[PDB]
């Protein structure tokens, strides 16, 4: 949020889980970040280039983290033939 001056005044901007679009509280100790690096020809994944996902504790307890991570990677193009939108 911005005041009348225009700058951003707040303690911090919480990050939102990519699986449910809900913010992660400071005490969400079951909310983890998954980091996966891209790969080139003949393997040998180049360090420094990676894609990140955040999964909230609510999803982790509900048990939907596996399918949510499958959807995220399939949409990004990192996995093939694992998750399908038509069940």
């Amino acid at each position: 949020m911005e005041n009348e001056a225009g700058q951003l005044v707040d303690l911090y901007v919480p990050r939102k889980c990519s699986a449910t679009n809900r913010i992660i509280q400071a005490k969400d100790h079951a909310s983890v970040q998954i980091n996966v690096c891209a790969v080139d020809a003949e393997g040998r994944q180049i360090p420094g280039e990676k894609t990140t996902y955040a999964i909230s504790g609510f999803v982790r307890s509900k048990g939907e983290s596996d399918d949510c991570i499958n959807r995220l990677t399939t949409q990004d193009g990192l996995l093939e033939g694992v998750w399908s939108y038509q069940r």
């Binding site: 699986a19 939907e64 399918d67 949510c68 959807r71 939108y85 038509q86 069940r87």
Partner: protein
């Protein structure tokens, strides 16, 4: 789970559901045209018939009503359409 395409459910996932519970409810019954074993006339019958069916020509009972699909005991070469 937690993300599905309700617009286009799978055909297999639809044939296993109740007719009302489907996305668009529809009948599960049909009509078939049967032929008398010793005649030439063709008579259309319902898969869930509740009445005794008698062929137009000289013939005996066609099928016996029941709770579900009636059983055909005459040797009729039925065509379903």
């Amino acid at each position: 789970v937690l993300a599905v395409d309700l617009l286009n459910p799978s055909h297999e996932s639809e044939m296993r559901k109740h007719k009302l519970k489907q996305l668009v409810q529809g009948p599960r019954s049909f009509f078939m045209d049967v032929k008398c074993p010793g005649c030439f006339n063709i008579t259309t019958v319902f898969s869930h018939a509740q009445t005794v069916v008698i062929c137009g020509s000289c013939a005996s009972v066609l099928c016996q009503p029941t709770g579900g699909k009636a059983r055909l005991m005459e040797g009729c070469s039925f065509r379903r359409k």
